[PDB]
Design a protein around this ligand. Sequence first.
Ligand SMILES: Cc1cccc(C(=O)C2=C(O)C(=O)N(c3ccc(CC(=O)O)cc3)[C@H]2c2cc(Cl)c3c(c2)OCO3)c1
Ligand SMILES: Cc1cccc(C(=O)C2=C(O)C(=O)N(c3ccc(CC(=O)O)cc3)[C@H]2c2cc(Cl)c3c(c2)OCO3)c1
Lengths: 123, 123
Amino acid sequence: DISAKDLRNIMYDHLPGFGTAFHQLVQVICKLGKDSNSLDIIHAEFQASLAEGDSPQCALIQITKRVPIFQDAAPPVIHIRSRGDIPRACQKSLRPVPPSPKIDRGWVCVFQLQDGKTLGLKI
Amino acid sequence: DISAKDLRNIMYDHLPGFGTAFHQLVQVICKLGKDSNSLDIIHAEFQASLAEGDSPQCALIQITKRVPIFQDAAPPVIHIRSRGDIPRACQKSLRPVPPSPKIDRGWVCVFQLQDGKTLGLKI
Ligand SMILES: Cc1cccc(C(=O)C2=C(O)C(=O)N(c3ccc(CC(=O)O)cc3)[C@H]2c2cc(Cl)c3c(c2)OCO3)c1
Ligand SMILES: Cc1cccc(C(=O)C2=C(O)C(=O)N(c3ccc(CC(=O)O)cc3)[C@H]2c2cc(Cl)c3c(c2)OCO3)c1
């Protein structure tokens, strides 16, 4: 059986750069996947998209649009201290949070900072 | 000017018992009120409701219906370890989280537990 850590490693293996918004999307997919006992179907979808010739980035986005736990889903809230806790390669992807953000519309997660500031990570 | 702690103490002084769902609603009102620089209007609405003869419980609900930061607002996510971090008097008000919980519909907050469990506090 595949673990959340295994799936993270598999997905990271295909991504360029490091600490990018796509790496964070992997984290979200793995966390929500684990919490919904869906790591296997998610892995199968990822591999199937790659096998069709999709970019790994598109494979991750297709998971958000095809696997039902992400469809019309609000992004998870992640509590952190400051913007400094977020990798450099994610910084320019941070945005003010819109009213109903949705994972399948590119809103990966919402970071809540210790002083109450709130930023959404957008792809 | 009134602080979030001052307001919390004022509201607690009107509520019977301790650690109830209404005490948690005070916490949410004061935190969100502080983050939106809205403690003054919140206090004014609370006092006005009491002055019309409303119960302090209803005055708190009135705040969620009358102060625009709570109108059609999703409940805040609060990260905790387990149900053991929630006071005894709130336990029976914890519910599975519905698709679109709203503060002004009685969904005070969403507790996210460390193992991935999620519970909404409902009034
Ligand atoms: C930039 C940053 C700061 C702080 C946290 C994170 C982050 O995404 C996560 C972790 O540091 C982490 O350990 N997460 C995680 C991912 C999958 C599992 C499933 C498992 O292996 O048991 C567990 C933890 C990340 C994480 C991802 C999400 Cl969606 C979270 C979260 C943490 O808390 C609330 O929602 C990212
Ligand atoms: C049952 C339980 C467990 C853990 C936290 C709480 C809770 O509601 C909060 C606190 O322990 C706390 O210190 N909060 C709080 C309330 C107002 C302010 C404004 C200020 O005086 O600076 C600051 C902190 C409570 C709290 C309320 C909300 Cl809505 C929160 C939250 C914490 O984290 C994210 O969203 C309640």
